[PDB]
Amino acid sequence: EQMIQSVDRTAVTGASYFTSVDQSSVHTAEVGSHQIEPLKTSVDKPGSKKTQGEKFFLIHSARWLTTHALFHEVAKLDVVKLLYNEQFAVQGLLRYHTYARFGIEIQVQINPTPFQQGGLICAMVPGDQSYGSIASLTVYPHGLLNCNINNVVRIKVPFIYTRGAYHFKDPQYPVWELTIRVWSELNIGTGTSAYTSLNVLARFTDLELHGLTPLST
Amino acid sequence: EQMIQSVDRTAVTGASYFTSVDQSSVHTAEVGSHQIEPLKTSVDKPGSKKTQ
Amino acid sequence: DDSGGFSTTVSTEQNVPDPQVGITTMRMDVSGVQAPVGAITTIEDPVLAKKVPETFPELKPGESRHTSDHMSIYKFMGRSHFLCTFTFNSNNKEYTFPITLSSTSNPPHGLPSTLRWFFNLFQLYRGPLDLTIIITGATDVDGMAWFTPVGLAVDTPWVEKESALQIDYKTALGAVRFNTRRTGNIQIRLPWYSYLYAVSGALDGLGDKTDSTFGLVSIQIANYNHSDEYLSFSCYLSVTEQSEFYFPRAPLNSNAMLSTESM
Amino acid sequence: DDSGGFSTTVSTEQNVPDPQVGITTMRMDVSGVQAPVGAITTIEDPVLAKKVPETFPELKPGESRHTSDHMSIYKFMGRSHFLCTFTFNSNNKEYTFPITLSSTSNPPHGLPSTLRWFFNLFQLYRGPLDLTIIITGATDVDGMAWFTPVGLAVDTPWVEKESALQIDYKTALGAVRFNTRRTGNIQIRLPWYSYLYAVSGALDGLGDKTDSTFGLVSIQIANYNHSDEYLSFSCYLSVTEQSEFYFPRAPLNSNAMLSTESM
Ligand SMILES: [Cl-]
Ligand SMILES: [Cl-]
Numbered sequence A: 001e002q003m004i005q006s007v008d009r010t011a012v013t014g015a016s017y018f019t020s021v022d023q024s025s026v027h028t029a030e031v032g033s034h035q036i037e038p039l040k041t042s043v044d045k046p047g048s049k050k051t052q053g054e055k056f057f058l059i060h061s062a063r064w065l066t067t068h069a070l071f072h073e074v075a076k077l078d079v080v081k082l083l084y085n086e087q088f089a090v091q092g093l094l095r096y097h098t099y100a101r102f103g104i105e106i107q108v109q110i111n112p113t114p115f116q117q118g119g120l121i122c123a124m125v126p127g128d129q130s131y132g133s134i135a136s137l138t139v140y141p142h143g144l145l146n147c148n149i150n151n152v153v154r155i156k157v158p159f160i161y162t163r164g165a166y167h168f169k170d171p172q173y174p175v176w177e178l179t180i181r182v183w184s185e186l187n188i189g190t191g192t193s194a195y196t197s198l199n200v201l202a203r204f205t206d207l208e209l210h211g212l213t214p215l216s217t
Numbered sequence B: 001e002q003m004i005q006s007v008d009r010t011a012v013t014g015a016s017y018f019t020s021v022d023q024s025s026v027h028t029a030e031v032g033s034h035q036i037e038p039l040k041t042s043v044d045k046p047g048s049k050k051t052q
Numbered sequence C, D: 001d002d003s004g005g006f007s008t009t010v011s012t013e014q015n016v017p018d019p020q021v022g023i024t025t026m027r028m029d030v031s032g033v034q035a036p037v038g039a040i041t042t043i044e045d046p047v048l049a050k051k052v053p054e055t056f057p058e059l060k061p062g063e064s065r066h067t068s069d070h071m072s073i074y075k076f077m078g079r080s081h082f083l084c085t086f087t088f089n090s091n092n093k094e095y096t097f098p099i100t101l102s103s104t105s106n107p108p109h110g111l112p113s114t115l116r117w118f119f120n121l122f123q124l125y126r127g128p129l130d131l132t133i134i135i136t137g138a139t140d141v142d143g144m145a146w147f148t149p150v151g152l153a154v155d156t157p158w159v160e161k162e163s164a165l166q167i168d169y170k171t172a173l174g175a176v177r178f179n180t181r182r183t184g185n186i187q188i189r190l191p192w193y194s195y196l197y198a199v200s201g202a203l204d205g206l207g208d209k210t211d212s213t214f215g216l217v218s219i220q221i222a223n224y225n226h227s228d229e230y231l232s233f234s235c236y237l238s239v240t241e242q243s244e245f246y247f248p249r250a251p252l253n254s255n256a257m258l259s260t261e262s263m
């Protein structure tokens, strides 16, 4: 006795985090297959979590003056919060995940003319500076800047928090508060430029995103 | 192709001289099993045709 | 599925290209004295729909009497079909016509008959084409022709006028010269020189203006005292083996199939 | 770098935890009659800065006379330090104090002396704590105490008042009962029961209200006719071996180190 083929009523399909249960189903139709460009139309690595999220972006940028007294805070930044912003690509990933854990890499640079002298200190402080001794900032993952010497510093850290991840849409407390203060008054000779601009670069490392969400705030 | 489990419509149950035919059936639920008194509550032969 | 997708029912190929040959041959019976299971199916299901159709007992057809299979695109379109035709009125003038798949552009200012039909059977085309052009009328008329790729300078389309291009420029893109007396026809190959991956006929306005063109041809006459006869030009195209055709479309409905009615 | 980053110069560990022992021992000279290269360096560079400091010829220190190394946090903080103290005025009342690292909350309504200092030397804390409390004054006073985890119901903090909690509820979270006559002191362990990964002292307002607390302790007296003496309670905390300390911070500046001045 020959059995004659009849469609398969019930079935379950989906992809990533979307599932469908269908009761009066049928099979899926497909045509052709994936083709690989024998001649690539673009040579850059195809977009990936790392491509778009684990790269560098310019966070903030300020000035350092001869008028700035010792320990003057030239910058106080919620590194994380700053990245979360349309201005940078990484947003596209954050904007749609509720929480995420990660490490960070900070690069701070300046351009003092050898006729200038003095220095700054850059520290990655978790949460808040609280009442920590300004003079002991070196304890935190830091980078020291001295005109006569270097014009750049780089710090790299992992996830350090009280919670298992940061909540973007509505945070509890900033993961990192990067502080930049005058470590030695910036003096100069009569005629030299009385300032030097400064920038801050940041990027995530080992970016673990979690829970796709439609929210925005 | 993965086949997905769907209940078994028709079925037949019963005991001794009582039979049932069910058309929109499903499986039977059971919990635990028969327990034997480690300490009998009664020592007489359990009722049986001969007993009674 | 490598795309992180999952399913419980399968996914088979739908409408697969070049399924069977086009000439009666044996690639017994074709179906019979058994039970025609392929007489029933649920067309909505892609898998089931592929089940081979069979209703009654038939025998194997046999062998066709002719060598080649007329349904092989390469061989069929291998017959250079009609493209367009124009006529010169004054001397030292030129005509420039584009080779556009556009279903929109209606002839004479567009693809006609067969060529029109053919190029709308699929979505993407690429590869060289063997153009051949017949000269009608006049004589002792010196002429020249050049292939201009999409996106570059070229005299205004579908229009007879005095060229506005440096002789240098023209010749530079690769050109040919001939004389009506000594010939009366030219068969030269058109290159796949385009910044696109391929071209298409079925498109919408915008793209229909850039991605629907192989390229353009320009013919310029000389020494044609109109005290002479008239000068007519007819162009025909034939597909080459280095030509490719990707993704089958639903054929153009009859009302859109037009032909340049003449003689 | 697995993060798709690249560099041409290196990246070494900066300020590495537990670098050397805290007791004079040999883990010849320590440096000498050679050439003190570690007398010069470019502190701005993380690598170079780790170069071992050496300026003059010295000899090996030798051996300390005492067994244990006083600089091992576990052993040092192993000395149960002072936390807080309060006094009951009426009968059948209760006091509930939170264990908060917050550098903000100033004593008596907050972490004092050593404990205050210690918990601000690093960013994250987690792990059980051995609380021990001394009873002062009264006698034949029945009492009870229970540990309440962050985020749950509990009588208003830093305040003596009549409990507003079901005896059931109290006992349910695990509690203890005692009597001044028979004892005068209690040493019980506080669990790491929190929905957080860890807690911290240095924070800002918001988080400083949820993520800066281990938990809370509540002590309720009974049978204390105030015709009697006064009833004082003093609490001290000692870190356990199952306690962990992650990421070193810059110590609190002196002006912020406060102590509950009494006697
Ligand atoms: Cl002649
Ligand atoms: Cl003109």
Ligand SMILES: [Cl-]
Binding pocket: C181
């Ligand atoms: Cl001749």
Ligand SMILES: [Cl-]
Binding pocket: D160, D161, D162
């Ligand atoms: Cl009260």
